[PDB]
Amino acid sequence: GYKFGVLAKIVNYMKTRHQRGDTHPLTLDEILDETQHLDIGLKQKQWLMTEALVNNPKIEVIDGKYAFKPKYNVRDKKALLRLLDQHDQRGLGGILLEDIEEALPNSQKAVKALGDQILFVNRPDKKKILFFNDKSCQFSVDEEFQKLWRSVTVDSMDEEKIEEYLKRQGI
Amino acid sequence: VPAALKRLAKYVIRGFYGIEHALALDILIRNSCVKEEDMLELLKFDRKQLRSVLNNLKGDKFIKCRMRVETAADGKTTRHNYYFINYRTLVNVVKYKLDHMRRRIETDERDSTNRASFKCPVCSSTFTDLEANQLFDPMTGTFRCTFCHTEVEEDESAMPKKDARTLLARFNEQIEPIYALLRETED
Ligand SMILES: [Zn+2]
16 A cells, blocks of 8 residues: 555644644654654655645645645634635525534524524535525515415426416406 | 516516426526536536426426437437427417416305305314305204204304405415416417
8 A cells, every 4th residue: 555545644744734733834754753754765755745735625735835724624614604605696505504613513503693683504414505685685474474375286287287277266 | 479478488487487497498498409418417406306406397288208219329318308389289288278267267266155164163074155044943943063962153154255356456466467477478
């Protein structure tokens, strides 16, 4: 095994290092020192530099050095709000709750602060997807009204009777 | 595509139907013709839920689907279903539902009076007013059911008529914007 295993180790190490508040970037040798990878090959080094830490969306390239990407992920209520607004405006769709949960520790506070602004979609497998509440036009009906609408069957009713009814009622 | 049709469609989809249908209709508004796999990715729903929603929409016939088949680069057939918004059928079905509810109002008003005014708590079944004479016993001097022989209270049929009458005002108040939007969409 070689050239494919240590990438997971380094990405996990730098993620956990950022979890400790190390916002400052770190050089490759800094991580290599404490990860017991002093015997790492040169071709592994250049392959890492050219592909691994530039293709992933979790590594930021600044002043030549490499750091976390906390801006992309959610860390506050305002970031969640603006991300959801962008999703609603551009129609990109929602986002899984687990991504925000792992990005934002104690994400329930933002959820309960948003309240009705956030919308949840309940999947069969307990997973929840978050949507923005587009308040352009809101209208609601009574439960009795909804039962009345559901009582009337329309899927098993064809297109001849629909236009026969219009002339029957004389509109 | 006049904006009045789009506004009316948005109002009816947001008021009568849920957010998923509103999102689907907004997607179809942004692009007139959309392939069945196009609105499958950018919303992050399960395939079965979207299929059920599309089944309901095809049941109410708000949009129309045209069958198209073609070939792929690798040689396998490709079956893409192309969905496009048809406002001509949309306004017709909306008006059909509108007049259906309108006539439902009068049928409910008639049925409120048609409900039986005699109820026996022992058997818990409505008893028609006309046959109350048949249930009445001439030699007893008082009216009772033949099956259970208990006093009948006619006060249990008083409140549903009042409840329906109160809902008439709310229905008539909330239905006006739809008629207001209908007038500008005639042309
Ligand atoms: Zn009885």
